[PDB]
């Protein structure tokens, strides 16, 4: 796929590497990455042919997908010979949503505390992010609170780059579709309104779990849910993928719940 260096290429000498974020992804300070005379903290993914290929692929897909507030956006890349391949994306200061919500378990009240407004807001933003990804004809496949990051001003962003999150048709037919992401989104909702719990608490994930799931067994309401939010989870977990809401419908609906809240 093409790479427009004019548009995306960023000088390696304007990146100052910092602390690692994981397995390599590092914090860095980038000067002028948005064309203003500012220093900004960014996240850098860096590096076999196989692996060079995988990272370039990721870069070209981020370019193909393009920009939305509720995804972790591409900012630039260092691809020119004479240094490591580096893919530069937005840095999300508060880390992943699951770990963050767990840390606020004692700092939550329904109405620096989290509130229902915050949880419904995060839910709404992820749905908008997914509506966007669907319109670019993407499928996420691993839509989970650990893959949502929290940035400043309560902006949440989907990482675009586990049987407990999988739709029944995905387990039983290896099917990943956008409607199977809607199922996962329901599990993500549960994660939000449990403030970062693991889904299916105490339940062993075996052939019996899968059986009960195909049969219609579902998680009970999590501790901090509204009844409207639990109903939405049940809707996302419809056994017939075509009877699940679409992401556009979830955006409209969560927007109404948010606006009403
Ligand atoms: C790396 C684990 S994390 O996603 O929870 C995380 C932890 C701390 C963070 O900041 C203090 C962030 N912030 C962040 N901004 C961007 C990214 C990012 C971008 C691409 C890949 C990864 C990554 C690296 C290793 C494992 C999972 N994701 C993170 O992480 C994320």
Q: SS3 sequence, 82-147? A: CCCCEEEEECCCCCEHHHHHHHCCCCECCCCCECHHHHHHHHHHHHHHHHHHHHCCCCCCCCCHHH
Residue 23 Cα, ligand 1 centroid: separation in angstroms?
9
Q: CA-CA-CA-CA torsion for 10, 16, 21, 24, nearest 10 degrees?
A: 60
The residue contributing the CA closest to ligand 1 atom 7 is 95
Ligand 1 near 26 CB (within 6 A): no
Domain spanning 92-260: CATH 2.40.50.140: no
| Three-point CA angle 74, 236, 143, nearest 5° | 30
CB 168 within 8 A of CB 217: no
**Resolution of the experimentally solved model in angstroms:** 2.1
State the Rg of the chain over Cα: 19
Which of 21, 73, 93 most suits a substitution to test ligand 1, by most atoms within 8 Å of the C-beta? 21
| Technique used by the depositors | X-ray
Ligand 1 near 119 CB (within 6 A): no
DSSP 15: E
DSSP 206: S
22 is in an annotated binding site: yes
- Judging by beta carbons within 10 Å of its beta carbon (0-12, 13-18, 19+), is residue 85 exposed, middle or buried? middle
Pairing mode, if any, of strands 86-90 and 148-150?
Answer: unpaired
**What is the CATH number assigned to the segment(s) 1-91?**
3.30.200.20
Question: Domain limits of the chain?
Answer: 1-91, 92-260
Residue 215 Cα, ligand 1 centroid: separation in angstroms?
37
Counts of helices then strands in the chain (DSSP H, E): 9, 7
Q: Can you tell me the distance from the alpha carbon of 154 to that of 90, in angstroms, rounded to the nearest whole number?
A: 15
Is position 34 annotated as part of the catalytic site? no
Rounded to 5, what percent of the chain is helix, strand, coil?
45, 15, 40
125 is in an annotated binding site: no
Q: Can you tell me the distance from the alpha carbon of 250 to that of 185, in angstroms, rounded to the nearest whole number?
A: 10
């Amino acid at each position: 796929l093409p790479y427009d260096a004019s548009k995306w290429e960023f000088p390696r000498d304007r990146l100052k590497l910092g602390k690692p974020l994981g397995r390599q992804v590092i914090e860095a300070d980038a000067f002028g990455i948005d064309k203003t005379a500012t220093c900004r903290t960014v996240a850098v993914k860096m590096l076999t042919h196989s692996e060079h290929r995988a990272l370039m692929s990721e870069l070209k897909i981020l370019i193909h997908i393009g920009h939305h507030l509720n995804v972790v956006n591409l900012l630039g890349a260092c691809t020119k010979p004479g240094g490591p391949l580096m893919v530069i994306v937005e840095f999300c200061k508060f880390g992943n949503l699951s770990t963050y919500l767990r840390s606020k378990r004692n700092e939550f009240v329904p109405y620096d505390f989290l509130t229902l407004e915050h949880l419904i807001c995060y839910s709404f933003q992820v749905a908008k992010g997914m509506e966007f990804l669907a319109s670019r004809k993407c499928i996420h496949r691993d839509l989970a609170a650990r893959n949502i990051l929290l940035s400043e001003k309560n902006v949440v962003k989907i990482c675009d780059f586990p049987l407990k999150w999988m739709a029944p048709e995905t387990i039983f037919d290896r099917v990943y579709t956008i409607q199977s992401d809607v199922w996962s989104f329901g599990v993500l909702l549960w994660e939000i309104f449990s403030l970062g719990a693991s889904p299916y608490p105490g339940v062993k994930i075996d052939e019996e779990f899968c059986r009960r799931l195909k049969e219609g067994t579902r998680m009970r309401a999590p501790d901090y849910t509204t009844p409207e939010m639990y109903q939405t989870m049940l809707d996302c977990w419809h056994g017939e993928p075509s009877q699940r809401p679409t992401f556009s419908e979830l955006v409209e609906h969560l927007g109404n719940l948010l606006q009403a809240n």
